[PDB]
Amino acid sequence: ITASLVKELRERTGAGMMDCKKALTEANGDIELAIENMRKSGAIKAAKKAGNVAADGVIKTKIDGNYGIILEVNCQTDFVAKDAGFQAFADKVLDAAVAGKITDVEVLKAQFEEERVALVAKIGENINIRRVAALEGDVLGSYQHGARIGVLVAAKGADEELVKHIAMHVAASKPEFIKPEDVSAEVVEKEYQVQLDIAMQSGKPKEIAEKMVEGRMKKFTGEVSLTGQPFVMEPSKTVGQLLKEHNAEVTGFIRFEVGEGIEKVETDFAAEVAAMSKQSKPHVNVGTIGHVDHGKTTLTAAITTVLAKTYGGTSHVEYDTPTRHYAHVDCPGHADYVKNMITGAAQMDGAILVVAATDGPMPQTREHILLGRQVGVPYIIVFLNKCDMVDDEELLELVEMEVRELLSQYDFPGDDTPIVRGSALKALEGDAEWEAKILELAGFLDSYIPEPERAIDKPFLLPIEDVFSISGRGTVVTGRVERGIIKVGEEVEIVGIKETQKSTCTGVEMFRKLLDEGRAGENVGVLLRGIKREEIERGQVLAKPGTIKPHTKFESEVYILSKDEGGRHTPFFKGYRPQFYFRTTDVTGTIELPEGVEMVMPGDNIKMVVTLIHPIAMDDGLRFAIREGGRTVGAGVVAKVLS
């Protein structure tokens, strides 16, 4: 049983490293029997994962003429939902449902159970076909809002685009029924006999409560039915009114949303770490990413434990080395991390990719790495976990190399990536040989991730909040020094909104003292030579000359608040025109949506190309808010400067 042979069975199988070593053992060096043994042992592997909650996955729709299918397939993480192999499975299932008009979920399940088991075998998450449904009508339309929401709509006397718009509406407004009358009339007469008790306790006349409940029940029934809902593309009119205008009729509709009605058992990363932990200067932000079973949480508890033991001391964890303070988050979800990054709730300086050496990279491991690329994480360090459960050291080298090449495929320095070979379990138990690996990993955090740049070390910048003309002295701007240092006698530029102007700092001032300089963090008045008050305005910045430029057009990564986060409750579309808040002021802009995106819902992550009415000092990384009349409804990060 050579490492070379195990490798052979690996790329033929996709099964974990040790699974191959083992199966190549009880089958002798016979690769073919090994294939069969593992393929046979798949059933139990899938059976073991079967207890795992799986609330992620995809919705799929497909229309062929007047017959349409909508399908849900689940998994554990959105990383796996994005994976090509998972996607292939679901598309295959979907295609089979359409071709054989299969609407019985059990026939569907039973027909793909072998592939499912084989897919769970190599992906390592509990994957399941959940539900499947079909819809027919004169005209069929569909809308996918990413992977999460699928809609089928059947109509009559309506054209293709009308149906598409209705589907988009259904996706956003979730009607339960078509028309108010359709509401299970017996399910609301109990709620009307429940409601009028509530009302009739004030001692308020019989007639009053009944009459009020009746009126309440009427609009409650309106909002839950298509017909009664404000059309999302024109809220001043209901979908019912829209339909009459087109002499059309909605026949039926189906809305699936991934995970609908499945528990939703949230996780407390920090506490799970502390729990696990018990039974057993520069500030740097890091995060763990990797497969659900590969011990990210165990590793984190081992890190906190060993570092505390050795050095003494947004659900996050904290730990210190002699030279650094670390904040540590987990990255279980792609969309979730992207959103945290955009809003500034989270921001990695480095990532720790956790791979169990017992398996080696999973298929979704590229998705884990691709996330790093997408949010532009500068550095990735690898922790190879469960190394105590691996006998042959040359197999460890096999895994190492697989990881390095994956990293290089996505433009990380695979060949120069620090890779620690450790054991979170063994270190957490107290075996010193393994604790040494934890310390080694912390050594790499210290050495491989550069200390992020301090504001005081950046070129001078002060966002201008107000401008004054002091008789007998001259012009003064006020603000908080955002970065760098401004000294009396130095030249400055006034950047943004207007043509750039130049001036000279003739003084720096606080309420109690005149100063020679202003430094990052400090609130000050900066006196300027020559320039007049009416030549400056809020929204411009003071900067060291040449260090920042004004721009009108940029690419951005944007998060749109959900209703509950106090943002919008309706979607917007192509010509959305809100205010963009940069540092001290709102600026009006227009957006271009990405190719193929037509609707944006509250709670969405989305990239937009923004064009501002006038220029604004900015560079890559500048965060901004999106506003409607002073109310914040979104947040953005400038990703690339354009025109």
Binding site: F511, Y581, T632
Partner: protein, 549 residues
């Protein structure tokens, strides 16, 4: 030749509501009739009707609206001189403190009053320390936006307080001088005088309210004291920035009957010099004495030498009375073996266990406060605190018509208050609806249809924004026109504005997501001065419609 909706709306907003008689009274009487209550026979009945604290909540809720709704109407013809009535009370209270000052500075005999003073003195000292700290004064001193002896309302903005030299009392001079020494900017004093200015503002139809307008530098330092007290009171579970605490405790008391709400009959003018000296550490008392105005000038030119420590317009009065009432209420609790954390205060508004009330009344008599038995509730189904009123858990907060209804904006305010009082979740009580629709007809046609959702002010009728023909969705944001006060720009004091800014920025279940986002927004706003002309304008604001069920 251009009647845009915007011009049409402005024209409508600038008309007068034309009606015979007292419109306010007519609205209230139609409302009573619709609920099956007898109408007000005369203007005199409006202000002298008492409700009965029994019946179903429905019965009580309208009955209480009846007792309150015209309680504060300021345009009756009853010949009541509400200013003279106020000055009468003002002299009486001052005479009251005179007696208190003498009795309290006057020599085994045993007493609840003295015992509570002894206990409160010790507890206040642990809470607030020996003397106001430099750090606290540095953090909390500031100018307000109100009038001072040198600045009338139109010059009330803080920028004008730095721009114009303010007055100060003799004892406050050294504070100003210490301020002056600490900065290169110059701080000017207009005059040194021991007088504040006493005046009346409206309260209800029977009487005005007396207040004082302080010398501006005194105020500047009073606010420092006020700020420090507000911080320290948090250690007694009292948050003077949050009225909802008392509101909830009132509701609770109306259900459990274990909490009492106690109203103090404008005893914000009965806090005697003597009581403060007995309760406060000497370092604090000296400072309070330094910063108060010892004398007042009345509107008629006569002067007063104050027996009370200070009055409503002083920048530490609200906090000082909170401290004083709280400390006494908490000592009464200790004396009775009640938990003193059962005590909450918000200025005049006191909440404590119903069992403590009789003892509290005795202590209050002894320290020169006069408890209003009619507005004190320690049994029965009714409680009231901090603007909220409850009857057996039911919100029965009334609304008030304060002024002659003249313009469409006045009528819209009244109709919107009716809406908020008479709806549940946007659904009308049919009894009130009929009155609402009737009086809505008095509005110019366009303003009858121009609706906004609740929570957007009163520049338009609260209703459904999606049926508003004047609302316009532009770039996926809906904009709605609302009525505003028409204004004209004034020039700001340039140096005064600069000092205000420089002084302010140098004096210094949330999700992590919207917390970092909030950090983005700069909270300072440039000084901008306006004068309102009395006419009305129209402004488009961004609106979100009510959410679906």
């Amino acid at each position: 030749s251009r009647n845009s909706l915007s011009a049409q709306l402005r024209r409508a907003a600038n008309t007068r509501i034309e009606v015979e008689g007292n419109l306010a009274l007519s609205i209230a009487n139609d409302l009573l009739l619709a609920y099956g209550q007898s109408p007000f026979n005369s203007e005199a009945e409006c202000i002298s009707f008492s409700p009965r604290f029994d019946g179903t909540p429905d019965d009580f809720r309208i009955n209480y609206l009846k007792a309150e709704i015209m309680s504060k109407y300021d345009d009756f013809s009853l010949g009541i001189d509400t200013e003279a009535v106020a000055w009468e009370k003002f002299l009486a209270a001052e005479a009251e403190c005179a007696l208190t000052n003498a009795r309290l500075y006057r020599p085994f005999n045993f007493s609840l009053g003295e015992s509570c003073i002894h206990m409160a003195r010790r507890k206040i000292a642990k809470l607030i320390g020996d003397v106001p700290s430099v750090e606290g004064m540095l953090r909390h001193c500031r100018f307000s936006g109100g009038a001072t002896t040198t600045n009338n309302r139109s010059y009330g903005h803080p920028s004008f307080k730095f721009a114009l030299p303010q007055a100060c009392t003799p004892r406050a001079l050294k504070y100003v001088l210490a301020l002056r020494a600490s900065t290169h900017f110059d701080t000017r004093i207009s005059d040194i005088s021991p007088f504040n200015k006493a005046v009346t503002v409206p309260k209800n139809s029977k009487t005005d309210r007396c207040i004082a307008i302080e010398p501006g530098w005194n105020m500047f330092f009073q606010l420092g004291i006020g700020g420090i007290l507000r911080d320290r009171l948090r250690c007694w579970g009292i948050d003077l920035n949050d009225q909802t605490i008392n509101q909830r405790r009132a509701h609770e008391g109306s259900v459990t009957n274990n909490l009492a709400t106690v109203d103090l009959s404008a005893a914000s003018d009965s806090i005697s010099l003597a009581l403060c000296e007995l309760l406060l550490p000497p370092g604090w008392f000296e400072v309070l004495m330094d910063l108060r105005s010892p004398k007042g000038r009345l509107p008629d030119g006569s002067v007063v030498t104050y027996e009370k420590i200070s009055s409503m317009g002083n920048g530490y009065t609200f906090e000082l009375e909170s401290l004083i009432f709280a400390s006494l209420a908490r000592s009464v609790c200790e004396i009775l073996d009640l938990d003193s954390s059962e005590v909450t205060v918000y200025g005049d508004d006191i909440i404590l266990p119903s069992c403590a009330v009789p003892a509290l009344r005795e202590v209050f008599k002894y320290v020169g406060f006069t408890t209003n038995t009619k507005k004190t509730f320690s049994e029965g189904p009714f409680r009231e605190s901090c603007g909220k009123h409850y009857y057996s858990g039911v919100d029965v907060t009334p609304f008030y018509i304060r002024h002659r209804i003249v313009s469409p904006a006045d009528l819209i305010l009244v109709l919107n208050n009716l809406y908020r009082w008479a709806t549940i979740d946007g659904v009308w009580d049919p009894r009130a609806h009929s009155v609402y629709l009737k009086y809505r007809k008095l509005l110019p046609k366009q303003l009858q249809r121009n609706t906004i959702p609740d929570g957007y002010g009163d520049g338009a009728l609260v209703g459904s924004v999606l049926i508003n023909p004047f609302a316009k969705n532009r770039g996926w944001i809906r904009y709605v026109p609302v009525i505003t006060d028409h204004t004209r720009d004034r020039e700001r004091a340039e140096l005064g504005s600069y000092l205000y800014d420089l002084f302010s920025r140098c004096l210094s279940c949330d999700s992590a997501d919207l917390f970092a986002i909030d950090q983005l927004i700069c909270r300072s706003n440039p000084t901008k001065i306006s004068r309102s002309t009395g006419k009305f304008d129209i402004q488009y604001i961004a609106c979100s419609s009510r959410v679906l069920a």
